[PDB]
C-alpha cells in the first residue's frame, strides 16, 4: 500500500543471502561474476587519464553519451555488426548493461505484453519484465543426449519456441554468450530466433555483455547483423565484461532510432547523464582495441586465450571430484551437473522445498570451502524442481585463486 | 503502441533545444547548472586515488553503496540531521540526485497517487511522477508585495497548500534550497509542510542537492530533522553540487528502513551497482570535509563565500541593464524578472503561444550573446502564461566568465 504495485514479487534477491553466507567462512570465491585480478593496464591508465586531464571532464557530459564514447561505439560496433550506426540516433550509454536492460524494459514493456525469456536466464530478466507489467513467458534450453557435456548441445527446440509467440509478445530476451550456461548461439539458432521475430513483429532485446569471452574458436554473432534485423534488435554491451572492470558500470545499447527514441525518454527521465570520466576511460579503451583489432597483442585476442586456459583448468579440477562440467563456448562461467551428488547425498540441511542445488551450494560453502551459485536462481519458479541439479562456477580468476581452489578440491578428494 | 504508455507526455525535453541554439552562437553560457572551474583539489585527488589504488576498486562494490561511502554518509549526515542513521538500512547510493528522485518516485508513486509539486519546480518532478502513473498536483510559491526582490519573500500560502492534500496524496516534493528560485525554506515553512505531512500521512521526498550553497547567513534546515519527520522523509543529495563535480553523478537517499526497503527494490531491479571509484572519491571527500567541519579552510565554508561573491557580482551586473534580479538565499541560481522588457518589447520571434520568457531567451542568445533558461520550463503548462516573465541565471562561474558576461552586458547597454 505505501509502495507501488510494480514492486510486487520482484523484491526478493537471491544474491545478498548467499554472498553473506560466503563471508562467514574461509572460502575460495567462484560465484562472483567479476575478475579478481586487475583490468588491463591500458584501461586503468585510461581512467587515470580522464580523472587527471581536462578538468571539465569532472562536469556534466551529454545526456545520451559522452561524444568520444558514442563515436567509437558507432564506429567499432558499426563495423562488427556491418551496420551504419549514427552515434546520436543509434547509441545510448547506460549505467552498465544492467541499466541498459532496465531502460529497454521500461521503454517497451507494458501491462499485457509478454516477454519470451530463455532459461537458464540471467535472473533480472524476469523481475524487470514484471516491474514493467509484462508477463514472462519461458522457454528452456534442453541439453542433448562422452560424459562431460557441452553448452552448444543445449538446444532451443524450434517447435517449442514458435509456440511461445502470441499476439501479445512484445520482446524476446536473447543473451549470448549465455549467463550462466556459456552457450554461444549458432548462426542457425540466431536465424531461428530472427525468423520468428520478423514474423510476429517482436523486438529482440539482446544482451551481448560477453561478446568477447568466446573460446575454442566459436564465433560471437549478433542477431542485429542478420538481414532485416537491425530494425527490431536492441544490442546491449558492458564495459565491465569487455575490459574486466565491472565496477566501472558503463554499458550501452545500439539499436534503430524508432526504438531508441523510447530508450532515450526513459533515460532522460531516470538518470539523464552517465558519469563523464568512466565514459572517457571506456572511449579510450575501445580506441586502443580497435587500433589493434585482431592483433596478437589486442586484449580481445589475449584475454580469451588466457581465460580459455582458466576454463580448461577448472574443468579438469572439478571433474576429478565427481562434478560433471558443461564446457562453455563463452561467458565467464561454466555450470556443473551435480546429479551424482544428489543420488549419493539426497537429504540436505535446507528449508522447505528449497531446490537441491541451493541446499548443495550451502553444504559445499560450509564443509568444503568453495562458492558456486545454484543454477535454479536462473529458472522460472515452476521449473526449479526439474532443473535443480546444476551449479555455476566463475573461472575468470587469478592463478592464485585456481591454486587455492585445487587446495580445497584435494582436501575434499580424501572423502 | 510499440512503446509503453508510461512514456506518454514525458517525452519532451526543453533542455537539448536550447543548449543547441547556444552552440550555434558566440555566447557567455549562464544556463548551465554546473561550474566551469575545477572541483577543489582534495576531491579531484580523491578520484585520482580511487583509480590508482587497490586494483579491486575497478570491480563491483556492494549493491546499496560502497561501504566507506555509506559509513561517512550515516556519520556526517546523522550528525547534521540529528539522526541515528544506519548505513545499511537508511542510506542508498544512486546515480546522482537525479537517479535518487527516480528511484524514490518508482518506489512510491502508483496509478492514482497525487504528488504535490511546488512551483517553480526542478522540471523532472513532473514527468517522473507521470511515468509512475501519478498525478502532479501543483502549488505556487507567490512573490510578496525596494525594487530588487528576494527569494525568501516568495510565499507558500498555508491555506492554498493545505487545500492541495487529498486522501490520494502519496508524496510532496520539497526542494531546498530551490532550483531555480534559490529559496531557502525557513523553519516555519518546513514546519508548515511537516505539519500537513504528518496529518495526512504523506511522504516528503526532499531534494537537498543544494544543501551547502547557502548565502547571507541563511541556514540549510532538513525537514527530516523535524520532530516525527524522519519516519516519513526521503532526503536526497548529490556529490556533484556538493563538490562541484557534476559529471561524477553520485547521489544518495537517506530515509527510514520501511520506506528505503522499496527504494532498494527499485535500485536492485534497475542499476544494481553504482560505479565503485566515484563512490570512493566521494567517501574520501566527505571525510576531508567532516575532519574540517566549520573550519575557515573547509570547502563548505570557503565555497559559499566565493559563490556569494559571484552572486553579488551577477546581481549588480544584470540590474544595470534593466533586469530585475531576485536575490537567492541559496542554490547555483538567481532568477530575474523581465516584466520590463515584456512591455518595452512585447512581440518577439517565437512559435505560437510560446511563453514570453522562452521567446526572450532565444532573442537574447542571438542578439546580446547571453544564455539563461526560461523559468516557465519549471511551471505546470497551465501556469506558464501567468509565470512567463522570469529567466534563470547560473552565477557559479569562473571570473573570466563574469568578465565576459560584463563585456556582453556593456555592448548591450549602448541601446
Ligand atoms: C554481469 C551481467 C550484466 C551486467 O552488466 P553490468 O555492466 O555489470 O551492468 C548484464 N547481463 C549479464 C548476462 C551479465 O552477466
Ligand atoms: C542538478 C540537480 C539535480 C541533479 O543532481 P545530479 O547529482 O546531477 O543527479 C537534482 N535536483 C536539482 C534540484 C538539481 O538542480
Ligand atoms: N552478472 C554477474 C554479476 C552481476 C550480478 C548481479 C547484477 C549485475 C551483474 C553474475 O551473474 O555473477
Ligand atoms: N540541475 C541543473 C543541471 C541538470 C539539468 C538536467 C538534469 C539534472 C541536472 C540545472 O537545472 O541546469
Swiss-Prot record, chains A, B:
Pathway: Amino-acid degradation; L-kynurenine degradation; kynurenate from L-kynurenine: step 1/2. InterPro entries: Aminotransferase_I/II_large, Kynurenine-oxoglutarate_AT, PyrdxlP-dep_Trfase, PyrdxlP-dep_Trfase_major, PyrdxlP-dep_Trfase_small. Substrate binds at residues 33, 179, 392. GO terms for cellular component: cytoplasm; cytosol; mitochondrion. It comes from Homo sapiens (Human). Homodimer. CDD domains: AAT_like. Keywords: Aminotransferase, Cytoplasm, Lyase, Pyridoxal phosphate, Transferase. It catalyses: L-kynurenine + 2-oxoglutarate = kynurenate + L-glutamate + H2O; 3-phenylpyruvate + L-glutamine = 2-oxoglutaramate + L-phenylalanine; an S-substituted L-cysteine + H2O = a thiol + pyruvate + NH4(+). GO terms for molecular function: cysteine-S-conjugate beta-lyase activity; glutamine-phenylpyruvate transaminase activity; kynurenine-oxoglutarate transaminase activity; protein homodimerization activity; pyridoxal phosphate binding. Its EC number is 2.6.1.7, 4.4.1.13, 2.6.1.64. Its main location: cytoplasm. Catalyzes the irreversible transamination of the L-tryptophan metabolite L-kynurenine to form kynurenic acid (KA), an intermediate in the tryptophan catabolic pathway which is also a broad spectrum antagonist of the three ionotropic excitatory amino acid receptors among others. Also metabolizes the cysteine conjugates of certain halogenated alkenes and alkanes to form reactive metabolites. Catalyzes the beta-elimination of S-conjugates and Se-conjugates of L-(seleno)cysteine, resulting in the cleavage of the C-S or C-Se bond. GO terms for biological process: biosynthetic process; kynurenine metabolic process; L-kynurenine catabolic process; response to bacterium. Belongs to the class-I pyridoxal-phosphate-dependent aminotransferase family. Signal peptide: none annotated. Disulfide bonds: none annotated. Its cofactor is pyridoxal 5'-phosphate. This is Kynurenine--oxoglutarate transaminase 1. The modification N6-(pyridoxal phosphate)lysine is found at residue 241.
Amino acid at each position: 500500500q505505501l509502495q507501488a504495485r510494480r514492486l510486487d514479487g520482484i523484491d526478493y534477491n537471491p544474491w545478498v543471502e548467499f554472498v553473506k553466507l560466503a563471508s562467514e567462512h574461509d572460502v575460495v570465491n567462484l560465484g562472483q561474476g567479476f575478475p579478481d585480478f586487475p583490468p588491463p593496464d591500458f584501461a586503468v591508465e585510461a581512467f587515470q587519464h580522464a580523472v587527471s586531464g581536462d578538468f571539465m571532464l569532472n562536469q556534466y557530459t551529454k545526456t545520451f553519451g559522452y561524444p568520444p564514447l558514442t563515436k567509437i561505439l558507432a564506429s567499432f560496433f558499426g563495423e562488427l555488426l556491418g551496420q551504419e550506426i549514427d552515434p546520436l540516433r543509434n547509441v545510448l550509454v547506460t549505467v552498465g548493461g544492467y541499466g541498459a536492460l532496465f531502460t529497454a524494459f521500461q521503454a517497451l514493456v507494458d501491462e499485457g505484453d509478454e516477454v519470451i525469456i530463455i532459461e537458464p536466464f540471467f535472473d533480472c530478466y524476469e523481475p524487470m519484465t514484471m516491474m514493467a507489467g509484462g508477463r514472462p513467458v519461458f522457454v528452456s534450453l534442453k541439453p542433448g543426449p562422452g560424459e562431460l557435456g557441452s553448452s552448444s548441445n543445449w538446444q532451443l527446440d524450434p517447435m517449442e519456441l514458435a509456440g511461445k509467440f502470441t499476439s501479445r509478445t512484445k520482446a524476446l530476451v536473447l543473451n549470448t554468450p549465455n549467463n550462466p550456461l556459456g552457450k554461444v548461439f549458432s548462426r542457425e539458432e540466431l536465424e531461428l530466433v530472427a525468423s520468428l521475430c520478423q514474423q510476429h513483429d517482436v523486438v529482440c532485446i539482446t544482451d551481448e555483455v560477453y561478446q568477447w569471452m568466446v573460446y575454442d574458436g566459436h564465433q560471437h554473432i549478433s542477431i542485429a547483423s542478420l538481414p532485416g534485423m537491425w530494425e527490431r534488435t536492441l544490442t546491449i554491451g558492458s564495459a565491465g565484461k569487455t575490459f574486466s572492470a565491472t565496477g566501472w558500470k558503463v554499458g550501452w545499447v545500439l539499436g534503430p532510432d524508432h526504438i531508441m527514441k523510447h530508450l532515450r525518454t526513459v533515460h532522460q527521465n531516470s538518470v539523464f547523464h552517465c558519469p563523464t570520466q568512466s565514459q572517457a576511460a571506456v572511449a579510450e579503451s575501445f580506441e586502443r582495441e580497435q587500433l589493434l583489432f585482431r592483433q596478437p597483442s589486442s586484449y580481445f585476442v589475449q584475454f580469451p586465450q588466457a581465460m580459455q586456459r582458466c576454463r580448461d583448468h577448472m574443468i579438469r579440477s572439478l571433474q576429478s571430484v565427481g562434478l560433471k562440467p558443461l564446457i562453455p563456448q563463452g561467458s565467464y562461467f561454466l555450470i556443473t551437473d551435480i546429479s551424482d551428488f544428489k543420488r549419493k547425498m539426497p537429504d540436505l540441511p535446507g528449508a522447505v522445498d528449497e531446490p537441491y542445488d541451493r541446499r548443495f551450494v550451502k553444504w559445499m560453502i560450509k564443509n568444503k570451502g568453495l562458492v558456486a551459485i545454484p543454477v535454479s536462481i536462473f529458472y522460472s519458479v515452476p521449473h526449479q524442481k526439474h532443473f535443480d541439479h546444476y551449479i555455476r562456477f566463475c573461472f575468470v580468476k587469478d592463478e592464485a585463486t585456481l591454486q587455492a581452489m585445487d587446495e580445497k578440491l584435494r582436501k575434499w578428494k580424501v572423502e
